[PDB]
Amino acid sequence: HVTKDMFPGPYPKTPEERAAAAKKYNMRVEDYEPYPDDGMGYGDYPKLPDRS
Amino acid sequence: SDAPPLTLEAIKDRVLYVLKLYDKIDPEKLSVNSHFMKDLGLDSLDQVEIIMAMEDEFGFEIPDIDAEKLMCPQEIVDYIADKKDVYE
Amino acid sequence: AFSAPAAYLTHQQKVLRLYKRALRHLESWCVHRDKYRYFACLMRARFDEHKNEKDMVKATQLLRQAEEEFWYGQHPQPYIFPESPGGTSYERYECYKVPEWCLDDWHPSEKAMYPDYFAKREQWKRLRRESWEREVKQLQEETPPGGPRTEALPPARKEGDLPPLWWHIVTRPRERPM
Amino acid sequence: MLKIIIPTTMLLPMTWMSKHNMIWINATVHSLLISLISLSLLNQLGENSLNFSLTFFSDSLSAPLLVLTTWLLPLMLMASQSHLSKETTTRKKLYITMLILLQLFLIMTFTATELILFYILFEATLVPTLIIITRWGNQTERLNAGLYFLFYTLAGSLPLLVALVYIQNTTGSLNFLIIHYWSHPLSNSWSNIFMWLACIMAFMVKMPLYGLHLWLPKAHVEAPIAGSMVLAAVLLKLGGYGMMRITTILNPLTNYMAYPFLMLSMWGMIMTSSICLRQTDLKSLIAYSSVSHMALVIVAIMIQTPWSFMGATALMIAHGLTSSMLFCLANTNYERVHSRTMILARGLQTLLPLMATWWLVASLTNLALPPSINLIGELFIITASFSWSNITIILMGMNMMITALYSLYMLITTQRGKYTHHINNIKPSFTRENALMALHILPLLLLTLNPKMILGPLY
Amino acid sequence: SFPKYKPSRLATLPATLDPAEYDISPETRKAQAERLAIRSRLKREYLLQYNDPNRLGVIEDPALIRWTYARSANIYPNFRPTPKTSLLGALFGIGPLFFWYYVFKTDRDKKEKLIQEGKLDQTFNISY
Amino acid sequence: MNPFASLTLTTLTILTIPIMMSNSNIYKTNLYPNYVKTTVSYAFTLSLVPLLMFMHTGQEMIISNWHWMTLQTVELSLSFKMDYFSVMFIPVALFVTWSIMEFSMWYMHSDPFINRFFKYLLLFLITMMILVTANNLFQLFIGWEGVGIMSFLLIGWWHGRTDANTAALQAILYNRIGDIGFVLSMAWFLTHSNAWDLQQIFMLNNECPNMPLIGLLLAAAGKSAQFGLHPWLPSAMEGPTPVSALLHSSTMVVAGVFLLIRFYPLMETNKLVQTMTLCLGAITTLFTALCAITQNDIKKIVAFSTSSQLGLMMVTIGINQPHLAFLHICMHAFFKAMLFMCSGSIIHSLNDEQDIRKMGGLYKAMPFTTTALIIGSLALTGMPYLTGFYSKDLIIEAVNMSYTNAWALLMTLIATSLTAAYSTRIIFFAFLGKPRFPPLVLINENNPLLINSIKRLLIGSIFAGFIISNNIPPMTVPNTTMPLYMKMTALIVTIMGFMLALELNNTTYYLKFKYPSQTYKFSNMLGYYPSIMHRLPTYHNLSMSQKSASSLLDLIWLETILPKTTSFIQMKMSIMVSNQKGLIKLYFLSFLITIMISMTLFN
Amino acid sequence: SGYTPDEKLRLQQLRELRRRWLKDQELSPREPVLPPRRVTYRHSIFAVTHVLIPVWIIHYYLKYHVTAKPYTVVERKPRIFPGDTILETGEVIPLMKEFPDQH
Numbered sequence A: 001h002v003t004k005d006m007f008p009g010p011y012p013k014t015p016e017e018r019a020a021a022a023k024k025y026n027m028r029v030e031d032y033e034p035y036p037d038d039g040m041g042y043g044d045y046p047k048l049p050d051r052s
Numbered sequence B: 001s002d003a004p005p006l007t008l009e010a011i012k013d014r015v016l017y018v019l020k021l022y023d024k025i026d027p028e029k030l031s032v033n034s035h036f037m038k039d040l041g042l043d044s045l046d047q048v049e050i051i052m053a054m055e056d057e058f059g060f061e062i063p064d065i066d067a068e069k070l071m072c073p074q075e076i077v078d079y080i081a082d083k084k085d086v087y088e
Numbered sequence C: 001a002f003s004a005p006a007a008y009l010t011h012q013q014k015v016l017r018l019y020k021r022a023l024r025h026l027e028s029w030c031v032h033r034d035k036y037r038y039f040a041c042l043m044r045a046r047f048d049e050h051k052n053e054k055d056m057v058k059a060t061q062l063l064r065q066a067e068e069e070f071w072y073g074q075h076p077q078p079y080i081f082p083e084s085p086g087g088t089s090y091e092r093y094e095c096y097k098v099p100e101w102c103l104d105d106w107h108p109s110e111k112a113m114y115p116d117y118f119a120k121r122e123q124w125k126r127l128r129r130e131s132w133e134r135e136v137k138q139l140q141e142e143t144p145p146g147g148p149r150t151e152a153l154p155p156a157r158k159e160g161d162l163p164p165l166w167w168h169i170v171t172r173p174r175e176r177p178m
Numbered sequence D: 001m002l003k004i005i006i007p008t009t010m011l012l013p014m015t016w017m018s019k020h021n022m023i024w025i026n027a028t029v030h031s032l033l034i035s036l037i038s039l040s041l042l043n044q045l046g047e048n049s050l051n052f053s054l055t056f057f058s059d060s061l062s063a064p065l066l067v068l069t070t071w072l073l074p075l076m077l078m079a080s081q082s083h084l085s086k087e088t089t090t091r092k093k094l095y096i097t098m099l100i101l102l103q104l105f106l107i108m109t110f111t112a113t114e115l116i117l118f119y120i121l122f123e124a125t126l127v128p129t130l131i132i133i134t135r136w137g138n139q140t141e142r143l144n145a146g147l148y149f150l151f152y153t154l155a156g157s158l159p160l161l162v163a164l165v166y167i168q169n170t171t172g173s174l175n176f177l178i179i180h181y182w183s184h185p186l187s188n189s190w191s192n193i194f195m196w197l198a199c200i201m202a203f204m205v206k207m208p209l210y211g212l213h214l215w216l217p218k219a220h221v222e223a224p225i226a227g228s229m230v231l232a233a234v235l236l237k238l239g240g241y242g243m244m245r246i247t248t249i250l251n252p253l254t255n256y257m258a259y260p261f262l263m264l265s266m267w268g269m270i271m272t273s274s275i276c277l278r279q280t281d282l283k284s285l286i287a288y289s290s291v292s293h294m295a296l297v298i299v300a301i302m303i304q305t306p307w308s309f310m311g312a313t314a315l316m317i318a319h320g321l322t323s324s325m326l327f328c329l330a331n332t333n334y335e336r337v338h339s340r341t342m343i344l345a346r347g348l349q350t351l352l353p354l355m356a357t358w359w360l361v362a363s364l365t366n367l368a369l370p371p372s373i374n375l376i377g378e379l380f381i382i383t384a385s386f387s388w389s390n391i392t393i394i395l396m397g398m399n400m401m402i403t404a405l406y407s408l409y410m411l412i413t414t415q416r417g418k419y420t421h422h423i424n425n426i427k428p429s430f431t432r433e434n435a436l437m438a439l440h441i442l443p444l445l446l447l448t449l450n451p452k453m454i455l456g457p458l459y
Numbered sequence E: 001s002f003p004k005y006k007p008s009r010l011a012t013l014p015a016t017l018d019p020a021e022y023d024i025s026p027e028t029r030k031a032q033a034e035r036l037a038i039r040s041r042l043k044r045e046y047l048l049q050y051n052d053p054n055r056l057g058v059i060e061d062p063a064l065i066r067w068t069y070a071r072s073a074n075i076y077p078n079f080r081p082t083p084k085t086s087l088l089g090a091l092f093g094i095g096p097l098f099f100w101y102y103v104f105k106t107d108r109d110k111k112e113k114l115i116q117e118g119k120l121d122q123t124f125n126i127s128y
Numbered sequence F: 001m002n003p004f005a006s007l008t009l010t011t012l013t014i015l016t017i018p019i020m021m022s023n024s025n026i027y028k029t030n031l032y033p034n035y036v037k038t039t040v041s042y043a044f045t046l047s048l049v050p051l052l053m054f055m056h057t058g059q060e061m062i063i064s065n066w067h068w069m070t071l072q073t074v075e076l077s078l079s080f081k082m083d084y085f086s087v088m089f090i091p092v093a094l095f096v097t098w099s100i101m102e103f104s105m106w107y108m109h110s111d112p113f114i115n116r117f118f119k120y121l122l123l124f125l126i127t128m129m130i131l132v133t134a135n136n137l138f139q140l141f142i143g144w145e146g147v148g149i150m151s152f153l154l155i156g157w158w159h160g161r162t163d164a165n166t167a168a169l170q171a172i173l174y175n176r177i178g179d180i181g182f183v184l185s186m187a188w189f190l191t192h193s194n195a196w197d198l199q200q201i202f203m204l205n206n207e208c209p210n211m212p213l214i215g216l217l218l219a220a221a222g223k224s225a226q227f228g229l230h231p232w233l234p235s236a237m238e239g240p241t242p243v244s245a246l247l248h249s250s251t252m253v254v255a256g257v258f259l260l261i262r263f264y265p266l267m268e269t270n271k272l273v274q275t276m277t278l279c280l281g282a283i284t285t286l287f288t289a290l291c292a293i294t295q296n297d298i299k300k301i302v303a304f305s306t307s308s309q310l311g312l313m314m315v316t317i318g319i320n321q322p323h324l325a326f327l328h329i330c331m332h333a334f335f336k337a338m339l340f341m342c343s344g345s346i347i348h349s350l351n352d353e354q355d356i357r358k359m360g361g362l363y364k365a366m367p368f369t370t371t372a373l374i375i376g377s378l379a380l381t382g383m384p385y386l387t388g389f390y391s392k393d394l395i396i397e398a399v400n401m402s403y404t405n406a407w408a409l410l411m412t413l414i415a416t417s418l419t420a421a422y423s424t425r426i427i428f429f430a431f432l433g434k435p436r437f438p439p440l441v442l443i444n445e446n447n448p449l450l451i452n453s454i455k456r457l458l459i460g461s462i463f464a465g466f467i468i469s470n471n472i473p474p475m476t477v478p479n480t481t482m483p484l485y486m487k488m489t490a491l492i493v494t495i496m497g498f499m500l501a502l503e504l505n506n507t508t509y510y511l512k513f514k515y516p517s518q519t520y521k522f523s524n525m526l527g528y529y530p531s532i533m534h535r536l537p538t539y540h541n542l543s544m545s546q547k548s549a550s551s552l553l554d555l556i557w558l559e560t561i562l563p564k565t566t567s568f569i570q571m572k573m574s575i576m577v578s579n580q581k582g583l584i585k586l587y588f589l590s591f592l593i594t595i596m597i598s599m600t601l602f603n
Numbered sequence G: 001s002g003y004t005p006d007e008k009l010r011l012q013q014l015r016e017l018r019r020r021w022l023k024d025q026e027l028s029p030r031e032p033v034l035p036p037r038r039v040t041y042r043h044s045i046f047a048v049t050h051v052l053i054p055v056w057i058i059h060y061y062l063k064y065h066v067t068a069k070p071y072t073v074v075e076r077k078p079r080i081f082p083g084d085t086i087l088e089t090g091e092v093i094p095l096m097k098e099f100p101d102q103h
């Protein structure tokens, strides 16, 4: 039932695609923030509070 | 265990017992449907110490988000019976 | 646990939570009853000095110094009721909680035992079947457009209706199934 | 040896001319009968071997693997019986045909008096497994997996073939007996180094070595249950059999050359055992556990001592049985939940208690609990490595601890706690699954009574 | 006054000691309101898909699928060769191997020397 | 013929019959627990006979009955050792087990899976009997792992509880940490001595080197919860009370110490290992008593007391007195089992309440448990002509009269003081003050099972020390001469502990409240050891197992090197080769160039 | 604070339904309909079926199989003290050196 656009993509660069990713992950644009854009394959995924 | 199967009458009796013991409430003026803030003029801190007395009494503690919005003995007994799965 | 939280906690809610926690931790400190009563009354007298303060900035400055003090003096091993999230029997009987639908998978030789119970269960299933198709429309019409704003559910308003999404809250297994 | 090969070949006629609804029963019955026949090879001697003919010979290293190979087929049939219910009779018959072909190729591979014939059958075993994974696989990445599972092997296998033919031009024979009796030392030269590497790498890639273990999680996750069973139980043991057979010519160059692979295996067993701790998938977790166990077996083979070989043989047999059982349990979960992730379906012990017992037994035997043969092989390899060098005990102990940790983690996450609420389509376990697990576990606890049956020719 | 509790990675700041919560603004209240609105639409969708009598299967969770796919199959396509990544990979995958090789080679060299000079006392060393 | 062998094998054999009948119909009835209890009691009264035979004669024997696989010159066989230690420990364990199952028949009444509980208890008993009587290292390892697995199963008795599963995994972790040293010792012994048999190991090792003894010490420290690997025993209290009364207090946790008892001839010929054992035991007993001195949960403080007693036993081993350590095992089993039994009766009477802050006056509200616990506390502290006295008086006597460490001596004395102090803490806070439980009183004791089971161990804790000490043959030189003050140190220190702790607890009644110091906070959080060591290593492991292990090498770089570089190279050269526009002009020019190259290159 | 008027109605209906279900959870006197079909004294039988047969079997196996092979059972060679006599030979170990006895 799931679509292609639902899955994580590449690291967001513009505010528009950052916003689109935030809507994808069911979070506010102000609350969304990706991991640092380094070689490690986090890509486009929320860096949630580490809290246990 | 050997615990007697407590019933609604026992819960209400015990709650009214704890309510009567408290000095700030005249025993003859309270009731099952007696409100706390207006019927009896008890403070919010008075309601939280009533919650504390109930928690000590029954051996379990009520969540505060449920505790802060309990203002009558009848609804408190109802909440506790719902928590303890009481038949009658 | 039953009632849904709100979008935030007001100042009075926060002060009540601190009062509750502080009194509980003090009781954990004072094992004997008379000492606990004395220090709890002293605590309540200290607390009620500022009930009539009206400055929002002063109110914010208050209860925060109180929270830091409480964190310093919190009795690193507080008393917990056995069934509380920190108790010694918090989730003892979760291994005894089985769902309702497992009875749907019972062998007919097993279902031959307890026939009245399964007849009543059949009545319950029919009631749920009708009440659900009623509740779908009831919730679809009652909900604010653009999605719900609070996760609290409305009650039933006609005569034959039942509360929306009622089956799995009424049909909880038990507190102590065995 | 033909008394085992011929009935296996006749299974093909038996399945294709069977009634459209009687394929499973006939295949299961005759496979169990063939296992009973293959049990006869266990009567080995302390002398050379069981030289049946110029083409086939048996050994106390070949016999346990042959018996396990014959025994696995009924289990594979019973496991695959479920998810092939909605298939045409032609495709189910093709599936069973692939299974029989794989068993036949393994049977001919494990006797293989000659090295070139061994290589040919050892490479022919690739095709039916590839077809099973790529055709009766669920996801879209299965094709990719197949390519991986192919090319690695071929990249490893091609120099070996060259090495093999070169050997026949210099020695004059590739029969195992002449090779053993006429063996001569290998002078430490560059050409001999490359010969050693060519002879070893083909089997090293299939074990798999820690560096070359990428293919195994993909192949296990993508394969159907029968593919996972045959890959975990037997298809990983081909590398061990090949190295054990081929190391005789490689002396004395083995002592110098073995250091990189020994270091890789000793560190990679820790690395994959730790990887098992953070895994969101059952089949991936069991794949990494298989990598750890086969790394220990690689260490045992490279050490090249009597205790090393005995422990390696015992561990190969035990790990095959245990991994097949664990994959069966995971597939039992998948066919019910259709998710294949550990965290979703939870607290199943309250709901499936006897399957919880099977889970506990499989986890205990994967944990290498004494006196199971898993621990027998583990302890023999550990003692041999300690004799090799006293520092290895640290790594072995770390591996044992992490093994216990991840095995009990895999038991805890799935069986204990509270069930997921929204799940309701979980039906009570069938008799087929319970019989599958019982037939998996009983041979292990029976074999621990007679360990000498699975300790190899160096016993 | 009382001594300050210092938060750490493994012992985080208490909920009631955050300076951020006490700085209240209508923007912050709107943020919390929309957060709870998102939480409530999620809860409503879950309960609607949950209490239906017709449904007899797993409720597929988009969040869990995103979690698993990001963990497993999204790593390499987003990888880039960086000095940090290259150095970390080379270190953590190469250094331990050479370290253990050095340790074991040194130990075996010492043992072989002790063997050749004859003072190792291998009496009763029969199984190897 | 010589009924020693027949009786000593029949005991263990009949211990397993209910396990064989676990598939029968009786397992589906309510009479199974009674069946198991009767079987174990009969086993105990049957094992009483070889003990009498040894007492009369001193008869020792080795029974190698079944021959397992033989590996070249090494021979493995099912061998049982029936020395003084085995024949002495068997009846004590069976007696304590009988008492524990009699208690369980009442405590686990409302448990739907009670037959499974009794089956688990009997499996643990069988595994411990296997461990004790083993003659070779392999059978010892079999028992070693069996008891640990049964402990894991019994701690996580309520699988719906997250913390119970956490405690079970913690016990497994620490026991595997000890297993590292165990396997090290086994490998060393086979490699050098060429056998796993105790006889050949003793024979061929006149001066045992460091490595095997260090491995044995690591295994014993892992199993007995010494200072390095202590917290699993306090955390093991999550399981039901009889499990903690049998396994984690008196039978399983002595096994590691018992292992160091088994190899005492090799322990006596090495001095560094003895020093390490002594120091580890001293630090363990002191730390555990200090932790116990501020605990509110009753099971936790009794568990810490058990840990301190195990540390004392390790000190006794370190001072080269194995027989005294074994005697201390024997008496500790009795009185600690009865202590935990009293605690369990208390907890059941107060609706599963374990914190002592909600427990007040039970001296008169329930008198038999009061007198049993007071006897047990007096015995544990150690008193003249009390069971704990023989083990306690002798241990202090020997450590004081030996060439040991002064620091270990001092920590042992402070440990005795803290032992008396926590005993008076528990009795004071649980039996003397005003009641503090919920008003609904469900206090009851009139149950024959609890009374008989408690009184059997009471009779044991009063008489067994004297009877056994005066019954066994002498095995060591006694300290007959001593300065009067040095003879009395144990009594004076226990009296000071009693008095000082009593006076400190008496100040609680005062209407004054002050904030604790740093020392109390350090003592309450278990020296902060469970915090740091359960958050710092784990995290730094788990993170790595995902970052460097899972993604960095396996998913990226190992993928990059062999397969991905190959794929990219194939892609590029395929594109280069196949990209021809089909103009025969370029093909013909290239053909001419190649013809020229061939004419100029190959000749 | 407190519940809202609408909230009370939901709790009332839900709690009454919960009571109905929880009452339905009870049992009738005939509900466990069991289908029957078949095909000192306690201690006396237990003492022979659980003690006597095992000792018989173990003693047989020890005396006639285990002890048949050498070195399977090895004893302690019991202590010999001065003044005793040995049944097999009949000699007496000589007494000691008559140390001075006082206190």
Ligand SMILES: CCCCCCCCCCCCCCCCC[C@@H](O)O[C@H](CO[C@H](O)CCCCCCCCCCCCCCC)COP(=O)(O)OCC[N+](C)(C)C
Pocket (backbone or CB within 6 Å): D035, D064, D067, D068, D071, D317, D443, D446, D447, D449, D450, D454, F019, F020, F021, F022, F023
């Ligand atoms: C459910 C609750 C319990 C009910 C049942 C209670 C009864 C329990 C008894 C069962 C086990 C308890 C231990 C008792 C052991 C007695 C039997 C044992 O002694 O016999 C063994 C014999 O067993 C066999 O050796 C082990 C069987 C090997 C299993 C082979 C696998 C089976 C084929 C299946 C396909 C293979 C798949 C795996 C390929 C390798 C060892 O024999 P051994 O002491 O030496 O010499 C025999 C006498 N000799 C000298 C004349 C020869």
Ligand SMILES: CCCCCCCCCCCCCCCCC[C@@H](O)O[C@H](CO[C@H](O)CCCCCCCCCCCCCCC)COP(=O)(O)OCC[N+](C)(C)C
Pocket (backbone or CB within 6 Å): D188, D189, D190, D193, D210, D211, D212, D260, D261
């Ligand atoms: C990626 C996951 C694992 C993949 C497989 C890894 C295992 C294969 C690695 C092979 C190990 C080394 C190969 C050759 C070993 C020879 C011994 C050498 O290391 O020692 C010195 C050799 O000296 C120098 O090392 C010469 C070799 C230098 C050139 C080799 C390249 C080194 C790095 C390349 C590694 C890349 C491997 C994979 C490529 C695809 C001793 O000096 P010398 O006494 O004079 O030579 C002795 C040999 N004689 C007797 C024949 C003369």
Ligand SMILES: CCCCCCCC/C=C\CCCCCCCC(=O)O[C@H](COC(=O)CCCCCCC/C=C/CCCCCCCC)COP(=O)(O)OCCN
Pocket (backbone or CB within 6 Å): D152, D155, D156, D157, D159, D162, D163, D166, D190, D191, D192, D194, D195, D196, D197, D198, D201, D202, D205, D212
């Ligand atoms: C998992 C995939 C890995 C694939 C295996 C890679 C390692 C195998 C080594 C490369 C192939 C070599 C095959 C050689 C076959 C054996 C023949 C032999 O040993 O005979 C030698 C021949 O030796 C050679 O010719 C070796 C030359 C190799 C050329 C191609 C090498 C391919 C690249 C090598 C670099 C990688 C080496 C290690 C890689 C390890 C795996 C990654 C003697 O030659 P003669 O002239 O007849 O002797 C007369 C004089 N005494």
Ligand SMILES: CCCCCCCCCCCC(=O)SCCNC(=O)CCNC(=O)[C@H](O)C(C)(C)COP(=O)(O)O
Pocket (backbone or CB within 6 Å): B043, B044, B045, B046, C011, C012, C015, C021, C022, C023, C025, C026, C046, C047, C048, C049, C050, C051, C052, C053, C054, C059, C062, C063, C066, C067, C069, C070, C073, C074
């Ligand atoms: C052992 C642990 C020690 C912890 C110590 C913590 C320090 C304690 C000292 C606290 C000092 C204060 O009072 S901090 C004072 C914070 N500011 C105010 O209280 C202003 C107005 N007060 C309210 O509105 C309340 O709700 C009220 C009217 C009281 C009740 O309301 P109700 O009518 O709805 O019951």
